[PDB]
């Protein structure tokens, strides 16, 4: 699941620095705002997302950020 989010984020930031993807975390289709900076900082934003749903997105955001820098 958390790996499947990194896949969709990676496919979104290929032709644009800002995109929106749909993620099915757990029993809900969550709209997800994906953003990247020139320096390479990724922010994943979920709106109207339950704390739980927000934390899984923070875990995915940290995992992909380490892959970006490395």
């Amino acid at each position, epitope marked *: 699941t958390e790996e499947e989010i990194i896949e969709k984020v990676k496919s979104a930031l*290929l032709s644009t*620095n800002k*995109a929106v993807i749909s993620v099915e975390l757990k029993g809900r289709t969550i709209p997800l705002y994906v953003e990247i900076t020139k320096e390479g900082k990724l922010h994943l934003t979920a709106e109207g997302a339950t704390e739980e749903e927000k934390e899984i997105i923070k875990e995915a955001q940290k995992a992909f950020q380490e892959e970006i820098e490395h």
Partner: antibody
Amino acid sequence: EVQLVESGGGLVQPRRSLRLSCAASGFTFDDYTIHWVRQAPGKGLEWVSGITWNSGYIGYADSVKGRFTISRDNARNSLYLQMNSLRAEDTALYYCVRDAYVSGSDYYYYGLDVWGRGTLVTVSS
Amino acid sequence: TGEIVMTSSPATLSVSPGERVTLFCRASQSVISNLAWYQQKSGQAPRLLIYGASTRATGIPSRFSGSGSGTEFTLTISSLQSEDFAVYFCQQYNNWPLTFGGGTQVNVQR
């Protein structure tokens, strides 16, 4: 003179193979992602495949996955497309297209800004 | 699947020189402003007109303008001219696979 020039198209039988080439000119080839986009005769456009500048990401349309292989040689400023298990539906004009979005640049552009004239691929017995 | 389907409309359009032309593109999911517009004349490679949802490419005449954000987009030709008779494609670039619309063919009214 920013341009992309395709080569390698021709008549091919079904189930066989063909290798398309694309030569870049007038721009830094190692900074852009490059795409293959095909157009069936009298029909719309269809994205086939794309490669990032360092070949770090490679994408294929579901209609050509497993059969097509894209690769690039930034030393020769050349793009290649290896087509295997060719079918009649693969008959189209194949464009070599440069993506305008360069990650890490100061001023961003978007879309498909540089197209080649295309090379025609006919799959028929 | 994650693939975003582009829907062009109308399939064909007939207009006279001087008229105002509006072409529509609809996305199956949200694409924000990651939408481009292309012009293709007969037997020629597509030419990029507008890359941001409203940002005109360099060299593109001012009569072309684009609009929309999300899943509903429009391309406007304020005063169509003779060289504007072609096929117009929309293309999203929110996420791969890159996808195009079917296209709208603008024809000469008679």
